[PDB]
């Protein structure tokens, strides 16, 4: 909601708008009683079906007729330091309207808050969370293979052991090393050496450096021991069945 | 003992073991059994919420002219209140999100900056202090503050006498040791005007209290008993019992070998009777 | 004070003594008579005469009554005759009130406790606003009026008016609403409170029953509208309107500053006083209580015990009369005191008892001597602060007659033509037999009867015997409660019983037109509660019926009783002569 209120700056200075609280969005119904209740609270302003009327003298409504009840709350243009009245009606709408308002170019701008995607869309990953790309977990498991990777590979794996939506669409920005643009399956295919050298030097951000320094240290220690044993030709996606006994033995040797 | 006293005075319904009778309840009103148990297992509760001074400070902030003009309740100023809690933290200050494998890391929130509030509420600066600041300064600083106020003054005086006031006012209950919680409980009961007719039974509280913490608790119980309170504590500390004006030492021998008063009276009296080994110890002392 | 003409709508036609009495009272007040008496017999209608006098004088009138009981029945009635003027009300606004009291012997603090009434305070503030907003204002007041108050000066100052169209900062409006004791109840809608939603603001004023909605065009007064508080039904719209503070402890921020200064000074005074007295416990208790009080002035300005600092708030000196509804009145305010024969003794007795309480309060470290200042005006102080004084009673008080020179204005012949009863006197003996005989005689026509008594034991014993003789009889004692005599009224209007046996309290709160006979036991004793006022009251009681009768049974005859009877019978002959001159029999009304 803080962005909703602060968006008044985004809309040009002085441009007319309306303090529109979508209390009952598009839910049609004869609501003269609701008008009376809104008056009982006391606002004197309302807009239904996109047309403004006073709560003192609202229009007639029928159940059959669509009624987009976004009550006008206050009379304001984009003013300077009007945050007092703005917030006054704005948190009010954030409850009555339940979190949504609009400052249209009545003289457009929509002051709405939506989760996941900013536009209220669905996401391959609901947010920037690693488990979202875990097919061993149901997050990445395909509908038709459940993470196994088979139906003949399942139609929604096609080689990648991951959901197509959570393959690269929300995770194609891995700027590891140079030209870095990787899908989860792409890193999987990155051999031991490929991925290790990719992560040896990569620029993804300062907060990412801070919160993935431990990641780099663990990986580089693991790879240093892996080289101390002389094991790089195995790939990150290489089938675990390739373990020759000595392979996992060296894995544990490095670990210990 | 505890079973019978609690069920006869506090209305408990626990099993009284095997005793023919108890007397002297006529000289008492309601017992209190206290131990090391933590006061609160969640950060939700905090020193303010436990002590009950929280709503008092909330009303204090409501007393600002800015609070008047906004026209909103002491609950508004709260930190466990829906409206005033920034969604970025639910007004918890930092932002928390983590999975099972590894622990989280504290991160100040745009709203908070550690303020565990919302600036909308913090705009009031009652007595030149925001709600964040008021909840910030720890017990001793709050004590030297709020001087002409009364109930908060009694709370803070109790805590100052406890002498552990260093604890942050918003210090999470989970971030407080069992002995610290014990001191909090004895402080809270120190502010209930029982006239001393009540009696406190207690475990061995050495854990969670340093030597000085034990001395502070000793002063607390001294004030209680001078206010008329009775007390009985199981304790392996010779100093604590020698400070207690009377001793009842039970048990000729450990385990089933005990089960009867071997000696009692003033610590010195019980000491003069070597029927207890604790008595032998109180004898070699003094 | 814009005084609208006291429009009197009186379908009743004045007759009998009414014209002469009103004319002579009018010329009395014209003659600068600061002291006047009226002799208003029973059924002479003092209310109408007072209303007409107030109409003639066109002054803001303060009427003084001795108990809240009386105020109710009259004020509503006058509003009928004055439906176009400010008619108001004021008494103790306490469903219950334990004072701040101190048992010194037991060192027990019976702290001030009060169940607060609402409508009483509402009418109090309505009266203060009307007085400080118009001259055509009539206020009925209990002695509480002379207690300590705030200044009508600040009352009229803090009040603020807003008009349609005029530019006014809405936030400043909220600020002044706070300063005039009105809460931004953004949650619900309550008396003397208000809510803000957008430019719209809706407020219930403390004194005004209804509410008001104001629409704002930015920081301009867009429009004003009356409203039902909850439903919001716009009663009407007016361009402008004023708002008075919801408190009578009105005081600007500067007045709070001065009050705090003087409070601290007299706090040092009382500190030293109790320190010398050795009452250290009381000194410390008062010190901490007033420390909290001043803390929440410096923060809020509102608390309990504010009255105790009236001398600081009003700012006048110690021992002087504290502010009063009299100050709320002009100097040319009309003044009327009904039953002043007990209101003035009540004034002195209340001052004495309350100053005895301010002892063991202030003298014993509970408040400063400013509490003692927040007191009923000493009788002399009241006598100065009043204007012209008019006492109303068929039994003028002794000090009242001393003030007025003994002269008065008569109004005893009712226009109806009712006449006084026929009195009879017999010795105490032959009382039970005659009582039963008259009981049966009246029960033939199913009529009422009254009985008085002196001692509780003999009273209830006699009622018990009467019940034993199969008599529809009841009795009254010292602390009887309303249900008993109200169901007695139901019974008598339903014809269940005939007689009652009371001692003292019966003398008040009984109007029984159906009793044609009363009995007065053992009037021989010279007693205060059985004085000439008592016998005259019984005479008025027995005068209700067309052919009422008095029967006093006592061995000897007291001077007051028989002089009262003789004057009653001669004025009865006068009333009969007036009736028959009109050719009209005594007319029940
Ligand atoms: Zn989207
Ligand atoms: Zn698949
Ligand atoms: Zn936050």
Curated annotation (Swiss-Prot), chain A:
The chain holds residues 133 to 514 of 972 of the full protein. Belongs to the ABC transporter superfamily. UvrA family. The gene is uvrA. It comes from the Bacteria. The UvrABC repair system catalyzes the recognition and processing of DNA lesions. UvrA is an ATPase and a DNA-binding protein. A damage recognition complex composed of 2 UvrA and 2 UvrB subunits scans DNA for abnormalities. When the presence of a lesion has been verified by UvrB, the UvrA molecules dissociate. Signal peptide: none annotated. A zinc finger (C4-type) spans 117-145. Disulfide bonds: none annotated. Forms a heterotetramer with UvrB during the search for lesions. It is found in: Cytoplasm. This is UvrABC system protein A. It comes from Mycobacterium bovis (strain ATCC BAA-935 / AF2122/97).
From Swiss-Prot, chain C:
Signal peptide: none annotated. Residues 431-584 form the Helicase C-terminal domain. Its main location: cytoplasm. Keywords: ATP-binding, Cytoplasm, DNA damage, DNA excision, DNA repair, Excision nuclease, Nucleotide-binding, SOS response. Forms a heterotetramer with UvrA during the search for lesions. Interacts with UvrC in an incision complex. The UvrABC repair system catalyzes the recognition and processing of DNA lesions. A damage recognition complex composed of 2 UvrA and 2 UvrB subunits scans DNA for abnormalities. Upon binding of the UvrA(2)B(2) complex to a putative damaged site, the DNA wraps around one UvrB monomer. DNA wrap is dependent on ATP binding by UvrB and probably causes local melting of the DNA helix, facilitating insertion of UvrB beta-hairpin between the DNA strands. Then UvrB probes one DNA strand for the presence of a lesion. This is UvrABC system protein B. It comes from Mycobacterium bovis (strain ATCC BAA-935 / AF2122/97). The gene is uvrB. The chain holds residues 23 to 611 of 719 of the full protein.
């Amino acid at each position: 909601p803080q962005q909703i209120v602060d968006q008044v700056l985004a809309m040009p200075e002085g441009t007319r708008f309306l303090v529109l609280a979508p209390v009952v969005r598009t839910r049609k119904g004869e609501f003269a009683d609701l008008f009376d209740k809104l008056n009982a609270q006391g606002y004197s302003r309302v807009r239904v079906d996109g047309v403004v009327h006073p709560l003192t003298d609202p229009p007639k409504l029928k159940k059959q007729e669509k009624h987009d009840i976004e009550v006008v709350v206050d009379r304001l243009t984009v003013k300077a330091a009007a945050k007092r009245r703005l917030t006054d009606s704005v948190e009010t709408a954030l409850n009555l309207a339940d979190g949504i308002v609009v400052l249209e170019f009545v003289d457009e701008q929509r002051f709405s808050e939506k989760l996941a995607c900013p536009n209220g869309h669905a996401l391959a990953v609901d947010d920037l969370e690693p488990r979202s790309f875990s097919f061993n977990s149901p997050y990445g498991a395909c509908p038709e293979c459940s993470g196994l990777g088979i139906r003949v590979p399942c139609p929604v794996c096609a080689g990648t052991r991951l959901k197509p939506e959570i393959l690269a669409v929300t995770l194609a920005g891995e700027s590891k090393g140079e030209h870095g643009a990787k899908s989860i399956a792409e890193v999987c295919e990155l051999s031991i050496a490929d991925c290790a050298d990719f992560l040896n030097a990569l620029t993804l951000g300062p907060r990412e450096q801070a919160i993935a320094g431990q990641v780099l240290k663990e990986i580089r220690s693991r790879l240093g021991f892996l080289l101390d044993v002389g094991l790089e030709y195995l790939s990150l996606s290489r089938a675990a069945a390739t373990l020759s006994g000595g392979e996992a033995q060296r894995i544990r040797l490095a670990t210990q | 003992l505890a079973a019978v006293l609690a069920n006869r005075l506090n209305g408990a319904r626990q099993v009284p073991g095997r005793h023919t009778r108890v007397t002297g309840l006529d000289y008492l009103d309601k017992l209190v059994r206290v131990d090391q148990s933590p006061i609160g297992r969640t950060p939700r509760s905090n020193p303010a919420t436990y002590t009950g001074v929280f709503d008092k400070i909330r009303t204090l902030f409501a007393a600002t002219t800015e609070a008047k003009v906004r026209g909103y309740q002491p609950g508004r100023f709260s930190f466990n209140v829906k409206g005033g809690r920034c969604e970025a933290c639910t007004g918890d200050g930092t932002i928390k999100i983590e999975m099972n494998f590894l622990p989280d890391v504290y991160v100040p929130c745009e709203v908070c900056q550690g303020a565990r509030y919302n600036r909308e509420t913090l705009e009031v600066h009652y007595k030149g202090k925001t709600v964040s600041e008021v909840l910030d300064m720890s017990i001793e600083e709050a004590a030297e503050f709020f001087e002409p106020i009364a109930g908060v003054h009694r709370y803070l005086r109790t805590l100052v006498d406890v002498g552990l006031g260093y604890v942050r006012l918003g210090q999470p209950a989970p971030t407080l040791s069992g002995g610290e919680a014990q001191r909090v409980k004895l402080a809270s009961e120190l502010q209930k005007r029982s006239t001393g007719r009540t009696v406190y039974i207690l475990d061995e509280p050495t854990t969670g209290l340093h030597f000085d913490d034990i001395r502070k608790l000793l002063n607390v119980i001294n004030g209680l008993v001078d206010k008329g309170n009775t007390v009985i504590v199981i304790e392996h500390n010779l100093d604590v019992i020698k400070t207690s004006d009377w001793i009842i030492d039970l048990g000729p021998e450990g385990g089933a070998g005990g089960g009867t008063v071997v000696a009692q009276g003033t610590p010195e009296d019980v000491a003069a009777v070597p029927a207890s080994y604790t008595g032998k110890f109180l004898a070699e002392v003094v | 004070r814009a005084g609208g003409h006291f429009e009197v709508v009186s379908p009743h036609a004045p007759a009998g003594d009414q014209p002469a009495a009103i004319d002579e009272l009018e010329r009395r007040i014209n003659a600068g008579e600061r002291d006047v008496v009226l002799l208003g017999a029973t059924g002479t209608g003092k209310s109408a005469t007072t209303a007409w006098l107030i109409e003639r004088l066109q002054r803001p009138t303060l009427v003084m009554a001795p108990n809240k009981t009386l105020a109710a029945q009259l004020a509503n009635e006058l509003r009928e005759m004055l439906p176009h003027n400010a008619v108001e009300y004021f008494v103790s606004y306490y469903d219950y009130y334990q004072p701040e009291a101190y048992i010194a012997q037991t060192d027990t603090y019976i702290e001030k406790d009060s169940s607060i009434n609402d409508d009483v305070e509402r009418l109090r503030h309505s009266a203060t606003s009307a007085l400080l907003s118009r001259r055509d204002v009539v206020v009925v007041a209990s002695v509480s009026c002379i207690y300590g108050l705030g200044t009508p000066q600040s009352y009229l100052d803090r009040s603020v008016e807003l008009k349609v169209g005029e530019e006014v900062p809405r936030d400043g409006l909220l600020r002044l609403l706070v300063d005039v004791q009105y809460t931004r109840n953004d949650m619900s809608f309550t008396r003397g409170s208000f809510r803000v939603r957008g430019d719209t603001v809706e407020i219930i004023p403390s004194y005004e029953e209804l509410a008001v909605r104001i629409e704002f065009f930015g920081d301009e007064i867009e429009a004003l509208y009356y409203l039902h508080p909850l439903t919001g039904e716009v009663i009407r719209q007016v361009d402008s309107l004023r708002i008075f503070p919801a408190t009578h402890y009105v005081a600007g921020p500067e007045r709070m500053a001065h009050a705090v200064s003087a409070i601290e000074e007299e706090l040092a005074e009382r500190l030293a006083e109790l320190e010398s007295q050795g009452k250290l416990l009381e000194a410390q208790r008062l010190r901490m209580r007033t420390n909290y009080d001043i803390e929440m002035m410096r923060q809020v300005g509102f608390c309990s015990g504010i009255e105790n600092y009236s001398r600081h708030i009003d700012g006048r000196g110690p021992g002087t009369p504290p502010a009063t509804l009299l100050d709320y009145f002009p100097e040319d305010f009309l003044l009327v005191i009904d039953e002043s024969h007990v209101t003035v003794p009540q004034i002195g007795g209340m001052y004495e008892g309350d100053i005895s309480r301010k002892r063991n309060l202030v003298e014993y470290g509970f408040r400063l001597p400013s509490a003692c200042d927040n007191r009923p005006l000493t009788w002399e102080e009241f006598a100065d602060r009043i204007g012209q004084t008019v006492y109303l009673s068929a039994t003028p008080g002794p000090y009242e007659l001393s003030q007025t020179g003994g002269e008065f204005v008569e109004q005893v012949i009712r226009p109806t033509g009712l006449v006084d009863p026929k009195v009879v006197v017999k010795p105490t003996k032959g009382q039970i037999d005659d009582l039963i005989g008259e009981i049966r005689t009246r029960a033939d026509a199913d009529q009422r009867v009254l009985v008085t008594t002196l001692t509780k034991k003999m009273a209830e014993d006699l009622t018990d015997y009467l019940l034993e003789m199969g008599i529809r009889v009841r009795y009254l004692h010292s602390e009887v409660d309303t249900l008993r005599r109200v169901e007695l009224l139901r019974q008598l209007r339903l014809g269940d019983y005939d007689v009652l046996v009371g001692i003292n309290l019966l003398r008040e709160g009984l109007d029984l037109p159906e009793v044609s006979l009363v009995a007065i036991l053992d009037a021989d004793k010279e007693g205060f509660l059985r004085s000439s006022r008592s016998l005259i009251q019984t005479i008025g009681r027995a005068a209700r019926n067309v052919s009422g009768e008095v029967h006093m049974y006592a061995d000897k005859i007291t001077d007051s009783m028989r002089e009262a009877i003789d004057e009653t019978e001669r004025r009865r002959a006068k009333q009969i002569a007036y009736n028959e001159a009109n050719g009209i029999d005594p007319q029940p009304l």
